[PDB]
């Protein structure tokens, strides 16, 4: 199966690294294609002959339970468009250890590994990581910050669409994420660009390879393609209070004569502040609980109510032509990534992610739990004490204050709310451009509504 | 013989 080859390839990747140090301390010659093959062949020959013990991270009961789950419940993914393919990776949030995965529907009839090898746009699941998480991490927004969802166009003059909608008006970050509106995301990444935020640095620190960052639809998955295993690692990062642990299936390689030629060490990396990550956790909780973009929490409740009450957070994604659906799920302890789609890129049905993948993955979650009862955990996500609380106007997402609205000072007041920030001073006082994004025409409309106090 | 094991030492495959 996938298991043998996934496991063997990373083990022989580790041997490669080991040897290029042992059998040579090799130069920048390591960028030579002939040295690359040579050490690959040597790494392969090493494992075949050296009588090595290769300890993987794979939990036997859980992985086997996952293989049974796709065998028994994979059919729930099929919607008339074919035998819908699938990839899932289950990851320990505190270590980056991969405990089990689904490579696809049936190895014998399709050998493509959809957990580890196949690469596809993360679509809207890019958003928490590339746009909102970074903007929060930079003190550029908090939990109740307002963004524009007013009609706007890409630089090439085509409208930013969401299904058949050209947009609406102002909305909170919560609303923007629960619905996965696109315009707010566009404006957020555009602000990071304009302010010279090293988004590349953040993404690369989590192991993401993206060839061109100068792309407007980047936060929506444009110009990105990723493996499920890698994309799961990004969500692990948010789940584990902002601390990245590199994904892996090999924990140790011992030679026949006892010695350790490779062993996992924990190298945590604080990619987002704990304030940021914890604030995002609370946003992603409501993404699932709101049920706007996924029936997951309902599906799971009907199967296992007690497990439905574990503290589930996550995000959905769907590519433009419904060719890819994603659902990423975390409890404090584990993250489970899910992708469905077709190898030839045919469109899925419009409810394929909303319903089918959601229902399928609720079944997968339950199978995992029957295989290892305590494993999802009863821990809850919680705000880090480093989080700054600002009482802000609901209408502006900023503190109450005076503003000039076409001449005339307005004392802006109304119903307030506690907004959570990841900077030092929290929310600013309200200014005329209170939201992320918006044209002068948008703001005339928005302030008119507000001024109807 | 080289062995690949689950986390609990149970052999997945011999090479
Ligand atoms: Ni087809």
Automatic annotation (TrEMBL), chain A:
UniProt GO MF annotations: penicillin binding; peptidoglycan glycosyltransferase activity; serine-type D-Ala-D-Ala carboxypeptidase activity
GO cellular component, one term: outer membrane-bounded periplasmic space
GO biological process, alphabetically ordered: cell wall organization; peptidoglycan biosynthetic process; proteolysis; regulation of cell shape
Keywords recorded for this protein, A-Z: Carboxypeptidase, Cell membrane, Cell shape, Cell wall biogenesis/degradation, Glycosyltransferase, Hydrolase, Membrane, Multifunctional enzyme, Peptidoglycan synthesis, Protease, Transferase, Transmembrane, Transmembrane helix
Sequence ranges assigned to domain Penicillin-binding protein transpeptidase in this UniProt record: 89-321
Annotated protein name in UniProt: Penicillin-binding protein 1B
Coiled-coil parts of chain: none
Naturally occurring in which organism (per UniProt): Streptococcus pneumoniae
Domain of life, per lineage: Bacteria
UniProt keyword Metal-binding, yes or no: no
Catalytic reaction(s) noted: [GlcNAc-(1->4)-Mur2Ac(oyl-L-Ala-gamma-D-Glu-L-Lys-D-Ala-D-Ala)](n)-di-trans,octa-cis-undecaprenyl diphosphate + beta-D-GlcNAc-(1->4)-Mur2Ac(oyl-L-Ala-gamma-D-Glu-L-Lys-D-Ala-D-Ala)-di-trans,octa-cis-undecaprenyl diphosphate = [GlcNAc-(1->4)-Mur2Ac(oyl-L-Ala-gamma-D-Glu-L-Lys-D-Ala-D-Ala)](n+1)-di-trans,octa-cis-undecaprenyl diphosphate + di-trans,octa-cis-undecaprenyl diphosphate + H(+); Preferential cleavage: (Ac)2-L-Lys-D-Ala-|-D-Ala. Also transpeptidation of peptidyl-alanyl moieties that are N-acyl substituents of D-alanine
Automatic annotation (TrEMBL), chain B:
Name under which the protein is recorded: Penicillin-binding protein 1B
Shown residues within the full chain: 74 to 88 of 751
């Amino acid at each position: 199966d996938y298991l043998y080859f996934t496991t063997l390839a990373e083990a022989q990747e580790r041997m490669y690294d080991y040897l290029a140090q042992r059998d040579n301390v090799s130069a920048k010659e390591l960028k030579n294609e002939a040295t690359q093959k040579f050490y690959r062949d040597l790494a392969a020959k090493e494992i075949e002959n050296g009588g090595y013990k290769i300890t993987t991270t794979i939990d036997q009961k859980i992985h086997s339970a996952m293989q049974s789950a796709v065998a028994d419940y994979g059919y729930l993914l099929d919607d008339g468009t074919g035998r819908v393919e699938v990839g899932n990776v289950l990851m320990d949030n505190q270590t980056g250890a991969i405990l089990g995965f689904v490579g696809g529907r049936n190895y014998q009839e399709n050998q493509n590994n959809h957990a580890f090898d196949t690469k596809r746009s993360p679509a809207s699941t890019t958003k928490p990581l590339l746009a909102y998480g970074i903007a929060i991490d930079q003190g550029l927004m908090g939990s109740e910050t307002i963004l524009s969802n007013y009609p706007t166009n890409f630089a090439n003059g085509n409208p930013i669409m969401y299904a058949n909608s050209k947009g609406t008006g102002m909305m909170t970050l919560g609303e923007a994420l629960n619905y996965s509106w696109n315009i707010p995301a566009y404006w957020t990444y555009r602000m990071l660009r304009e302010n010279g935020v090293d988004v590349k640095g953040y993404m690369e620190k989590m192991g993401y390879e993206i060839p061109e960052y100068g792309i407007e639809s980047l936060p929506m998955g444009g110009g990105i393609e990723v493996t499920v295993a890698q994309h799961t690692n990004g969500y692990q990062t948010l789940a584990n209070n902002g601390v990245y642990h590199q994904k892996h299936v090999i924990s140790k390689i011992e030679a026949a004569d006892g010695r350790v030629v490779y062993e996992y060490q924990d190298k945590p990396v604080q990619v987002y502040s704990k304030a940021t990550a914890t604030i995002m956790q609370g946003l992603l909780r409501e993404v699932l609980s709101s049920r706007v973009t996924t029936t997951f929490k309902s599906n799971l409740t009907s199967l296992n109510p007690t497990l439905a009450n574990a503290d589930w957070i996550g995000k959905t994604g769907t590519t433009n032509q419904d060719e890819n659906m994603w659902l990423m799920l975390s409890t404090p302890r584990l993250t489970l990534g899910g992708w469905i789609g077709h190898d030839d890129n045919h469109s899925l049905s419009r409810r394929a992610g909303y319903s089918n993948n959601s229902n399928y993955m609720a079944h997968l979650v339950n199978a995992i739990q029957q295989a290892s009862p305590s494993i999802w955990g009863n821990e809850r996500f919680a705000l880090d004490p480093s989080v700054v609380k600002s009482e802000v106007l609901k209408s502006t997402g900023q503190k109450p204050g005076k503003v000039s609205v076409e001449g005339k000072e307005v004392e802006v007041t109304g119903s307030t709310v506690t907004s959570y920030w990841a900077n030092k001073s929290g929310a600013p006082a309200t200014s005329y451009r209170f939201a992320i994004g918006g044209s002068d025409a948008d703001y005339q409309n928005a302030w008119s509504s507000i001024v109807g106090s | 013989i080289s062995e690949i094991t689950y986390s609990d030492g149970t052999v997945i495959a011999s090479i």
